[PDB]
Amino acid sequence: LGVPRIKEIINASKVISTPIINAVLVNDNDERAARVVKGRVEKTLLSDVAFYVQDVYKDNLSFIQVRIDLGTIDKLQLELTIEDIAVAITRASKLKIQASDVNIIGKDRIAINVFPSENDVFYRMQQLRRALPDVVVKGLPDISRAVINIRDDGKRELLVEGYGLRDVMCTDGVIGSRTTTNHVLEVFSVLGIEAARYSIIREINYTMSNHGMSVDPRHIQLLGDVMT
Amino acid sequence: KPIRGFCQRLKGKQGRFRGNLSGKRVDFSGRTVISPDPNLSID
Amino acid sequence: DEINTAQDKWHLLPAFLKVKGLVKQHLDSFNYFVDTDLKKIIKANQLILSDVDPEFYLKYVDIRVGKKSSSSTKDYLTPPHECRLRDMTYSAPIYVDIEYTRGRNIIMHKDVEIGRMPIMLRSNKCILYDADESKMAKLNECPLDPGGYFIVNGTEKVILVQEQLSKNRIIVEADEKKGIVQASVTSSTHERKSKTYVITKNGKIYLKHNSIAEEIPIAIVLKACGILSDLEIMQLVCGNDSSYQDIFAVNLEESSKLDIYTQQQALEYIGAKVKTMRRQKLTILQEGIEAIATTVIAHLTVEALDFREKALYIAMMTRRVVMAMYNPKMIDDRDYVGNKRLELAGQLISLLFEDLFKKFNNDFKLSIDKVLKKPNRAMEYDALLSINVHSNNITSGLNRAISTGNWSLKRFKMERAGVTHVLSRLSYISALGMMTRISSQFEKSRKVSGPRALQPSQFGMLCTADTPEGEACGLVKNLALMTHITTDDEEEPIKKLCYVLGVEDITLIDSASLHLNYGVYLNGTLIGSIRFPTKFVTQFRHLRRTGKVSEFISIYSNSHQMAVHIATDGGRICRPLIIVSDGQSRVKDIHLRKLLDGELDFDDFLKLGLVEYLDVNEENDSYIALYEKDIVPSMTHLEIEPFTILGAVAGLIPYPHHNQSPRNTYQCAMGKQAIGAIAYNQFKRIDTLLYLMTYPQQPMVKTKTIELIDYDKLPAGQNATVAVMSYSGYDIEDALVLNKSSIDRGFGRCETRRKTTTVLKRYAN
Amino acid sequence: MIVPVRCFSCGKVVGDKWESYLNLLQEDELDEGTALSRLGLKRYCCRRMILTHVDLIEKFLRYNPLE
Amino acid sequence: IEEFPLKISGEEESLHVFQYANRPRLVGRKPAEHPFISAARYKPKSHLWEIDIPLDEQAFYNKDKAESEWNGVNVQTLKGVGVENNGQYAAFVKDMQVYLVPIERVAQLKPFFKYIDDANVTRKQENRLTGSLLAHKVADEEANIELTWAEGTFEQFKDTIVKEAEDKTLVALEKQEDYIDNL
Amino acid sequence: XXXXXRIEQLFPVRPVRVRHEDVETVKREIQEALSEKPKEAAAELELLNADHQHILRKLKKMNNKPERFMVFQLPTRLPAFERPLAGKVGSIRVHKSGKLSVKIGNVVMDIGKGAETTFLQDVIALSIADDASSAELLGRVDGKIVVTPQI
Amino acid sequence: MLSFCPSCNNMLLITSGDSGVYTLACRSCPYEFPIEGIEIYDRKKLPRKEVDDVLGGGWDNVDQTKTQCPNYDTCGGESAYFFQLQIRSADEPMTTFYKCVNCGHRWKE
Amino acid sequence: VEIAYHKCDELITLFNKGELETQPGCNEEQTLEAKIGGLLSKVREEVGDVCINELDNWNAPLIMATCGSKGSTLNVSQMVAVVGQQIISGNRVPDGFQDRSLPHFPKNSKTPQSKGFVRNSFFSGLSPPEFLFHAISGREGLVDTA
Amino acid sequence: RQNRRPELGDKFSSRHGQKGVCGIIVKQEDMPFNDQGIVPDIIMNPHGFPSRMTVGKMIELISGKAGVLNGTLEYGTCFGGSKLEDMSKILVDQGFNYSGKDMLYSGITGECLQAYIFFGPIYYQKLKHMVLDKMHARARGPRAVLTRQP
């Protein structure tokens, strides 16, 4: 929030440091009112719910097994049981190597089959083992993390650190008409140019009001009007 | 490569535009240390 | 009254300063140069030959400065003030003994002069060495002048101390959004090279250089260096740690993905990628060119079959990169005072003289060859006439370099601008501050505050206030009052002592149990491993304190990267401290009374092992008491006197611990613009600009430092009677009210002195 | 260089007491304060005019060009 | 209390100490085994040792690719440069007394794959030299002295050792402070 | 810690995989697990005592065995004696109250154990003669003893 | 997989060789291993996650002084948080930033 | 002041022997710092308030601060009573050595008077380490503004 | 050579960073005086002390006054030097206020000043910056050959 922030706003840089989304909730309850909507906007939880990963070989088949425990999902209130994880894994396989088949047996003890040039099966098995527990199984693959904040009024709202604005406005459990972000360029792409002008004016007023500088609002208004 | 071509005669902080066109050196001017004076009126 | 150690402890500081002056870096370095490095360079570039005339050779047997035979202290020199007045250069002649022959195969000698060498003020060669009050007066020299500068063409120039990042030391630095890149700039006598050790992608680590093509995997170079087991790599760069093995083993299979490897195949892979030999003997262009390209990858020299030392060097570099991959904050800081070295005036003059000597030898050889191009009457007699005519180029170049400060060399292709600076004569303290001043290293990076902040580690080694604000804040530094820079002592003789003490050779241990023990290092190169590192370090420190090894060799430990480090190079800032044993100081008071009486001139304190030197790194092992009343029975040292945190210019402030720090810095800056006495011969002098005070006065509130630097003999100020009050409204913001009739009686009365130089030169007509 | 004739604050003539001060210090050894008080220097300004003095002329005179 | 007079014995011996970077020791409480070897090799003026260990075909041999790529591979070849280290002394207890014999050099033996290199030298086909290049050229040019193993003929060395150690009785002249100057 | 998964001498080789938090603790157990023979000052004193009793036990164990050998690391340039090396150089004597020391004749030292080696070691005599070159096998190296001078 | 070949310690691989066998190849020396009668597997433990906590803020335990807010007529502020961490020049004095503990108005002096 | 150093001793010994209760935003290593960084701030403020209350009528620093012509009660509290805590880059002074700020303190030190807390006043005179910490804190702004 | 009188505009300093430019030069009679008639050479605004926090200056003034009276030079060194209580005792043994504040008279009206004044010797220094070397003024004259600008 210093002259680097003023410089970013003034330069209209497409990438800034520390972008923050302010999502306004609907309810007020710490347990199963804020966490149920925080769980829908988070990062790669495959290794966060996998609880181990196995590399298994046999007479003719080469396996990769993951034992996705359900107690952690029962604690962190998440909306995914078996097939959401399987669909995410198949999407990741399409993204990275290949989609052939995914077996599910019990307690989410998923298995993955491999076959195709020598040692290619071993190389691909090693790559899959290393790169498996790094694919998003729920939420937004564009957002670092979210934290629930206790407001001065007592309200319990969470604010998001990343670039997923439209997805957050669309997620269930948040007020989409009251949701803002740091990025004026993000506001411009989704909300329009007048919204971006308002965002520029507010961000300048905040960055120069938190430092103790007393500037008339009309100067900043003219700056925004010229910039946009 | 320290040679002064035509392009080098127009660029930089001390070129034509930023050194001799938008900002110059003027006649009838001076410069010395300052001291206070209460009995000097403001203005 | 008896001798109280609590208050009489500080008397060691005057004893130190008596035999180790404030200007002693310059003096000591130049002394050592003219005593040893001249002969070393002569021994290096000794014999100049010719292809023709197979019975002909030229040899330099011996060199000297300002001395022909063993008597009378020959070569009367023009006094420095005479040189200063006449616009000459204070220099002395260089002599050599020439070994030349004839077609009759005779051995003849001589005492041949080969130019003039500028002599540093107050050295073994300067006339002012150990002058008396009378002699200085006869030669028109002020006794209170610091010294340590050159007069060249009538101007006083000084070589500032130059900050550098230490050479031959692994420096692991992380980075965000990328990974870890670690480097080691290895500068040998003639070639310098940085073996960057970077991370490209995928969590695999490569090797880099300017003489290799692209991205050598570390497993391949480790196989090229004799570690071909492909599991010996694992136990080397990961130990037994699971968190390291999985993060490293990505690239354990890149040495098999291309194909299986042996040593020769890996060498071939590397050697296909080297650049060239600058178009010379390209018949080596095979696997055999790696027998030299692995030799030229680090300052570590391999000259036989085994590559174990360089192999394990790269393995340890790999281990550091793997640790920094596991987590940041295992990296080291490049602004840490213990990661930096100091280079003095003699060290640079050595390089300059070597380069000039080589150019002179080349031109002498071409002149001899051209004379011999005639097919008749090859008369080697009077060949020394050519050397006597041609030798003026070395003197001219020496003067040009040492009076321009632009050092452009060719042996290293190093080009620096602004080495020397003109000595400032604005006050007595201005020159003394020009000495003991340190200029920053390269990679200035003004936009970042890294090399700008004060460091806790510079306690008692660099002055905490002396800093020029403006735009060079934190880049220029100054020395503290009690410091001492090291000299490169040895590397070999103490390695045998290491092996005697209990460490095992690196060629006996296994990669399996390498990381289960503490490993000793010598100047950053792994030497072995030892059990009981504490016992090893205790015995080593005892042997150094009893004088069996050098007094500037530092040994310590590091529990993070389990190791004991031993440093022996030059350029490390030290400072004396008092050893405390079993909760008892080793001074015992009697030693202090003996020092006061006249014995024990601070050399016997080191000789008896009561005090000792410490660099920044051994201070990590140290645990020092500020005052004697703070000595718990778990301390290691006690400092001699805790006001040497400040330097010489900072020693003028009274009660500096009662002001804010920016005020102390502002006083350090502007105590050098104060006008007063300058020297005892300021009226015999003729300078570009002088400022003098008619009636200077001693300050009423002294400091223990101004007595040590003789500021009370050449002071610049007056004790005014002051009334702190609001008066007349003309003193509103840093404006003063001066008493007329104090000016009339003569108060703040000064004098200016400029000079004009004219030359009546001769023309070709 | 040499002792100033008068005192910067008062105007009291102290130019004739430098030699007396030195003689009192050397012969008939005395404290500096008692020497200053025996010389009639009572105000602290006049006392400092003689206490805080460096005789630089004796050091400039070793370099006379007419030796 | 109890005193073990350790003696010193004949130094006119070219003792060498082998180290194997592959084969471990003490797979269990048992102190492992000493492998069967044959066809040792040496190289004077470079001290390049070479040792041959014959492989086993009845277990884990892969004869097909073995023969298909390399003409015959039934022996393991270990190379290794024998470096000179100072202060090493080999100890064996003959009586309650210890017996010290110096080690001339120590070599660290690592696997040597000649057959792959031969594969390149058959397939890819279809001036002062100072430093380690000269050493490499000497080692690969003047080569291949030939040796014979002696697995258990240790019946002609201990006698000399127990005799070359019982041949002198000396007295020291260096003091305790003096040794500090020596070392 | 954990371990990822004539017959037993030819099974695939697996590395030692100890947890990062544990490696410091087990490192004081790995040293005593590499032998398997058939506040930084107190720790080092205890290690010295344990190594002393260990090496005394080994000295007793190797009373008379053909294939057992030991390696001693000595200070280079040990005190040269007077000609009356070859012969007897002091003694390695067991001290009192469970201590061990080595005497060279005028100087006493500290005798300890070296680093632990996880491989085989063999001692070999060599001859350069062209008529016959031999490699006589003697025994297998037991362990390493490092000797350090002390006041 | 990370297993090493006995007697050469190089590396073990799974090979797409002949007759559909995924045996444990070496590629450095002639060493083979039949997988038949399988028990091999590679277990990698994985820390899952923890229940994260809020970030309300702790204005308590922050530096406090005794000043007056500029907009006193609106909010009555007799205390304020501060830091003396702005120094323009050395000759010029330090600068102190405040914030109203009552309303939250930042300003500097 | 001795009261607030005993509580800091208690917090240090708790965080060492066991696992101290962890504040929401920060970790166990940061919980201790963020606690003592207010445990010292409160005592600094109370001592300053006491000295201002005891200040005399016709005290020139007080008249200037009350006038708004020069200075502040914070400045005069630093001059008279205590200049408390020297912080750089946002919090207490980072280590310059291995697990230490200076070689005069024991290894693994987090007590006040070891990380940039001065209990002296300018009237009393800073010790060598307080002197150095205050020097670093002062240099920060100088190297920032340019 | 050139001899220079401390004109109005010359810069001074006091070893505590309190640099300043001479603002006015006043006659001796228009200066506050004590019982003995001592008149100060320099008067400095007290407003430079509280915001800059230079109390080493104050201790220097007291120590200098006591040392002048006692006939000895005093030591102000880092983490030590002459103690303030000793200087106060020496200053009270000679009939001066222990805190260095003295009752002076106005020189313009003659009557006592209603506030006691901090009075004593402070070591100053004259700096090389002089208004003589800075006063520049141009009406017309030399111009650059290329741009024809001053």
Ligand SMILES: CCC[C@@H](C)[C@H]1CC[C@H]2[C@@H]3[C@H](O)C[C@@H]4C[C@H](O)CC[C@]4(C)[C@H]3C[C@H](O)[C@]12C
């Ligand atoms: C995690 C890193 C992702 C980053 C590279 C991607 C992810 C989201 C992207 C932004 C959004 O699309 C919205 C905007 C669209 C405009 O046209 C250009 C700007 C704008 C801010 C984008 C810039 C850039 O493309 C971003 C930051």
Ligand SMILES: [Mg+2]
């Ligand atoms: Mg200013």
Ligand SMILES: [Zn+2]
């Ligand atoms: Zn007077």
Ligand SMILES: [Zn+2]
């Ligand atoms: Zn193999």
Ligand SMILES: [Zn+2]
């Ligand atoms: Zn408010």
